[PDB]
Amino acid sequence: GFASVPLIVIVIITAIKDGIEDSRTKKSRISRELNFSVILNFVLLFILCFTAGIVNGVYYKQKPRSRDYFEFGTIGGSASTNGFVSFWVAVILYQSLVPISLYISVEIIKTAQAIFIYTDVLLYNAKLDYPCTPKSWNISDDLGQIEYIFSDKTGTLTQNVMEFKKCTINGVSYGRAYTEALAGLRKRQGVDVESEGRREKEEIAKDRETMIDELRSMSDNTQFCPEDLTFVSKEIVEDLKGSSGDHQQKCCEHFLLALALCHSVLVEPNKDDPKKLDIKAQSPDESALVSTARQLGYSFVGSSKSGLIVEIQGVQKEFQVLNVLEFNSSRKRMSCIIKIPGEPKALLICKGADSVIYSRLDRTQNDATLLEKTALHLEEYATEGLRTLCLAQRELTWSEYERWVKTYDVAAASVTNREEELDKVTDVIERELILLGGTAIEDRLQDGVPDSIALLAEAGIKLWVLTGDKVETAINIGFSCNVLNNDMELLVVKASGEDVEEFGSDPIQVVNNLVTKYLREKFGMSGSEEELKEAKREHGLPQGNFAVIIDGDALKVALNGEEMRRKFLLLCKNCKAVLCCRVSPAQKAAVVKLVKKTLDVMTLAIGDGSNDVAMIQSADVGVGIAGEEGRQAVMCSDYAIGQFRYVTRLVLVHGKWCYKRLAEMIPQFFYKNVIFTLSLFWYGIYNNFDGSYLFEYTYLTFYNLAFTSVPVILLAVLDQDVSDTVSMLVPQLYRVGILRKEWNQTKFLWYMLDGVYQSVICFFFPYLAYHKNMVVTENGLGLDHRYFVGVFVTAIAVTSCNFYVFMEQYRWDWFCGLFICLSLAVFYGWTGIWTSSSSSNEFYKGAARVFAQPAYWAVLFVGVLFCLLPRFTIDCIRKIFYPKDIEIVREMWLRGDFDLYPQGYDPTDP
């Protein structure tokens, strides 16, 4: 055949295109509705063929018709098997409504959309040289229905460029600084930020100059550089030698030694100057700590097999490292045991999370007041946006250390899931430590992230933040960006502190009572069985702008219990902000799966890092940021972009365009098939459904391939709802992609009904021009043949279908119009070419005979008019009287509101 063989080449060419466009799994959301629509189309085919078989067989037992004299049809069968063979021939003729090219056309269009995504200049990060490469091609329309964007504070919102700014040591806050976060907090307070900011900046410059002068007068270092001295505390350089006693001096010395020693950074020589070093590490905070420790006087260089070379204010000595336990996301701490001489003792120093270290803190040898001072200092640091880091030390005799080493090399040296025993050993050795202070490191946001989040939140997306730093820094960063705007209150679900006394019980009851209360006074929503049914059905829209804050323990308890899970789900359905802090990667995956599975919605899971891959993999549209060395989040992702500032284009422009293009394609693809098969059926009401085919045998294999199959693909690939500039300027249009107000079964059913009506008009005009005398040839020679009537009907149907595709296209370019005219030209010219050939024996003169008849054009013009008149009239009395937002926006920017900004414009650009 020719309706199934030429598709095998295309279905492999479309994959060769992907393979070529990749050297330089899971389905979409519309696919399920597509399968349902195909099933319903088969149902329509079956009912048509059933009616045809029913009629063909009724007249075999009728009056003596003219078939028993000239046809020799005298066989003892009329309905036992003749109806069966009539039904079979009817279905084999009606196979046109078996869409095989639909699953090829949709694949071609999705691949073309993905390629157009990959070749967009605005999706290109020049600094890193990484275009937006779509790892998965099937998901291109899923970007137009996103309702939740699960962000990640690791490397997406903030670049992993750590900057040491402050540090608390024995209750003294060494460090003064002023960045954009402090200015934002001051603006939130209300005081001036320009003059005060300039005064603070000049004071900071003076303090830094005094600090560097005192350091230079103190001693000399082989790696000192005045460009990497981001630490501006002159109160520590004086305390270093003797200037504030020895109790503070020795504590500061131990603090800086812990910073310089506890690390996992590799040391390499500088390319230009061998005396300079270019220490590199996977963890930017460790690199910042090592750099500031080296530049304050305690330099680190080299790597020996047993011990690390360190320079202390001039003296070059060699320590003895005994063991080191690395840093894991689920552990939130990194430790190392070394030897201190006088039976030398063992010194264990670890750095980790603010809460984890406090939990893993001894209750015997403590000042009983340094804990509170350090806690308040760390909270003050985090309030201004400084991700803290707690340091805990421990002294050990050789006996207990040797027993620990025996446990370590009997368990952590084994096989068969060693990591569990490694964790057991680490938690055994880290149960009694004394805090010796903390540090403060800050990192700025990306370029244009505040405006990107403003655009994302304005477009109805209810974005979440699954950060892990801590609650206060997350709140500050949400306020600095536009996740947390003004006129919004923060429902805190923290199960400790002040909200524990009011509901003193186990955390189960604490979170239950707190969530139930907040849900009760904030909304009339109490319930866990049926309110979920409204939540599922209403399709989602933010209202009453609130915010929710969730801790790691609060998250781990709010999704463990069933009632807890649905209460958390109903509570976190607020407008735009859900700040989940201190969360483990497993908690990230759990919350993403909760939001996705229950109340089925669309979940973007942008992230970066090897720990959040569980969030990307266990989501729907996993966007992977290409950031630091941890590129594992990009390979196991659905997309890949240079930095977060591109999502506001990948969701508001390409996603909406793709969703609208496919939602406009599919009903028209069912339309173009109905308008033909129903035409065959309407011819079938005559001749008593015996099984004659109205068109030629070569219109089965060329109506869905060349006549009217190119314009639909061009409509679904190269159609712009609105130019990308206006889509950036008016993100609210994306709202129609969230409420599922563009692709619903009512639209498809109405399109099929329009197809049936237009098939009626398409077939019954030639017959009405033939029924009276059937001599319409302007010279009486007579066409009279069912193939020429088929030419009439096919011409009307093809022209009407092409014009129907061209009407519903939002943007009339020179490409889609050219291919519509060229599709009409293909129909005419190929009828001419094939008819003037001996291989068209019966037909043999379609072009010369039919096309020269003025009756043919006189009926074609009216068929074209009467086919498009109802749809055009309805559109005119609906785009003027009940206009959607898109029509109003189009009218606006045609009037010349948005005529100032150029074509290559996006607000997410500094």
Next chain:
Amino acid sequence: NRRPKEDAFTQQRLAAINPVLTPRTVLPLYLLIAVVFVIVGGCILAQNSKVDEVTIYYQDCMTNATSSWSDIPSEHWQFVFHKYKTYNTAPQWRFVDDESDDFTKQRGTCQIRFTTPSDMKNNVYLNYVLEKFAANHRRYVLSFSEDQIRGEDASYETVHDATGINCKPLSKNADGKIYYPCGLIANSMFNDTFPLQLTNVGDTSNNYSLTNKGINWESDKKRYKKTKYNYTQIAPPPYWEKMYPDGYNETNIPDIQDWEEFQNWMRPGAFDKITKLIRINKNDTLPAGEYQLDIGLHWPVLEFNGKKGIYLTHGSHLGGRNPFLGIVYLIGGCICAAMALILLTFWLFGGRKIADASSLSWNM
């Protein structure tokens, strides 16, 4: 590097126009369509009301006929002239039997005399109209060997079990021969022997002559070629035996290249009614007067309660008399005008600002 190539086509910045159906450019379009289509419909009705035709059914010229000059019942004749709308003038019709032939189902001759009160210019077509003759059934239309039509002397090996287009039940006869024009189509030819002239009655000096040369598209003469059989392996189809009682001999082979009557019957009609050209006149105008036509009655019709008759017309540029095209242009124009007025009224009554920014779904 890896930067994608910037281009007006790659960056989705193709030159384009974005149209919106604002009333500033919708009412003019509707008025233009309405005016154009009303003009064309009026022109076509004006040109089409002028055409004239004569339809005379004669399936009842044997059983319900007299040997004297009767009048056709008002249920058969239909004269349509654009100059005499009150012109009944019932035509006369006579039956002349022929007892030589033993085909008692239908035989003889029909003498149908009508009157044309006007003239038809330079082109007169006489067609035979059939009715209630199913000629579009699946088995009927797909049964005719193409090789024999092309002139090849194809044998039973490639005439009976060829592809979907083959003469299955009428391939070979009982004597081992294969029918030359095999198939249910050629076996069911129209056997009514139409004459070669409309004999006048008021002036016998000038008969109106018709020639059956050129009643089919000339193009088919490049497809219907003379056969290449030796008149020893072919026989006429079972329904053709009365035309060739002695079978096929060296001289009676029908040359279908110029047999236009048979060429016009190898295109089966699409619908139940059939109208195939059988006589043409291209030289002399047919002057107004009374004319006589003598028609054979070989082809039986009443067995399946069908109808047959003659259809004489000059035609026009859009075929015969058919008001459908003009009616539907008028309907299209009227509907377009009515919709234009409806939009005008609903725009002057439910008026609203055109670029109404305060009407968006999120601004309310």
